[PDB]
Amino acid sequence: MELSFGARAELPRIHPVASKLLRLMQKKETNLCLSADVSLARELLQLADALGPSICMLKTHVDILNDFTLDVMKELITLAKCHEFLIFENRKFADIGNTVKKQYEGGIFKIASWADLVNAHVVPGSGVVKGLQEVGLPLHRGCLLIAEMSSTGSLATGDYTRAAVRMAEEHSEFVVGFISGSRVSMKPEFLHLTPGVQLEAGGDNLGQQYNSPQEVIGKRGSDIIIVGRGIISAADRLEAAEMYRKAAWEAYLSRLG
């Protein structure tokens, strides 16, 4: 029934970016995405270098980097290639198609030039995907749709979630998976990435809620954990990353049997 990440990498309908990701997940025994929520390029890069071997993906918010330049992203790419991880800009495109295509390709950030993956909210309807696709398909990029959110009061539930899944499944040449709290698609070609993860119970003061890797990967069937503060705020970010990696990887293995 369920397939390993390595086997999923080979599925007929797999997207190339998903395949690359799944292959390196399997090779490196990591289903951890670091949420590199820092404001300094040097810290970003130092985290990417040190934690690169432990992660399958590094998620950015370029718009919080005080000293963003495209050269920082070049350096990040070098690290991504060296250590084998994808770069995911958590931009949450969420506009009409005509707007998002420009936000993806252009401006100061030139996101499409460096991000293997981006994501989108599905609230605008499928034009958000169509617009992004116009830039991302030629650049061989992938997209994640936000089907569920980790925060208190999230409206990404029920029929909204179902709409996200449909929209993904209908745009499989570009959409490679989801941000979700659980498996939402039954199709194994899609990736599930789950934020709101910490080893300890809790949440923040602004609506973030946490669940553990075992819950999210093991019980809820997701693929990848996205971890920010649980790693970033720790003293030893490498050890923290390793804890999260080992947690998510074992949860995956055990669910696989």
Q: Is 159 in the active site?
A: no
From 9-17, 103-111, 184-192, 242-250, give the range in contact with a copy of itself by CB under 8 A. Answer: 103-111
The yes or no reply on residue 97 touching a copy of itself (CB under 8 A) is: yes
Which one of 95, 101, 116, 223 is the catalytic residue?
95
- Report, in Å, the least distance between residue 6 CB and ligand 5FU: 26
Question: Cβ-count burial of 75 within 10 angstroms (0-12 exposed, 13-18 middle, 19+ buried)?
Answer: middle
Q: Site residues for ligand 5FU, window 188-207 (CB under 6 A)?
A: 195-196
The yes or no reply on residue 228 touching ligand 5FU (CB under 6 A) is: yes
Cα–Cα distances in Å, from 90 out to 15, 200, 249, 257?
19, 24, 23, 32
CB-side neighbour CA atoms (13 Å) of 236: 6
Q: Find the binder of a copy of itself among 27, 70, 98, 219 (CB under 8 A).
A: 98
Range list of β-strands (E), 137-245: 142-146, 175-179, 191-194, 202-203, 209-210, 224-227
The yes or no reply on residue 95 touching a copy of itself (CB under 8 A) is: yes
Number of residues that bind ligand 5FU (CB under 6 A): 20
The yes or no reply on residue 224 touching ligand 5FU (CB under 6 A) is: no
Which one of 20, 37, 49, 92 is the catalytic residue?
92
Cβ–Cβ under 8 Å, residues 166 and 190: no
Q: Is 116 in the active site?
A: no
Judged by beta carbon, residue 65 or residue 224, the one nearer a copy of itself is 65
* Calpha distance 51→49 (Å, rounded): 6
The yes or no reply on residue 130 touching a copy of itself (CB under 8 A) is: yes
DSSP-assigned beta bridge partners for residue 192: 178
Q: Find the binder of a copy of itself among 29, 37, 49, 169 (CB under 8 A).
A: 37
Q: Find the binder of a copy of itself among 152, 219, 239, 256 (CB under 8 A).
A: 152
Q: Find the binder of ligand 5FU among 184, 227, 241, 248 (CB under 6 A).
A: 227
What element of type H or E holds 81? helix 70-83
The yes or no reply on residue 131 touching ligand 5FU (CB under 6 A) is: no
What element of type H or E holds 82? helix 70-83
Cβ–Cβ under 8 Å, residues 166 and 222: no
* Calpha distance 107→9 (Å, rounded): 33
Cβ–Cβ under 8 Å, residues 26 and 4: yes
The type of residue at 168 is: A
* Calpha distance 179→192 (Å, rounded): 6
The yes or no reply on residue 66 touching a copy of itself (CB under 8 A) is: yes
From 41-49, 76-84, 92-100, 241-249, give the range in contact with a copy of itself by CB under 8 A. Answer: 92-100
Binding site for a copy of itself (CB under 8 A): 37, 39, 61-66, 68, 90, 92, 94-99, 101-103, 106-109, 121-128, 130-131, 134, 146, 149-156, 160, 163, 204, 206-208
Q: Which residues are catalytic?
A: 92, 95
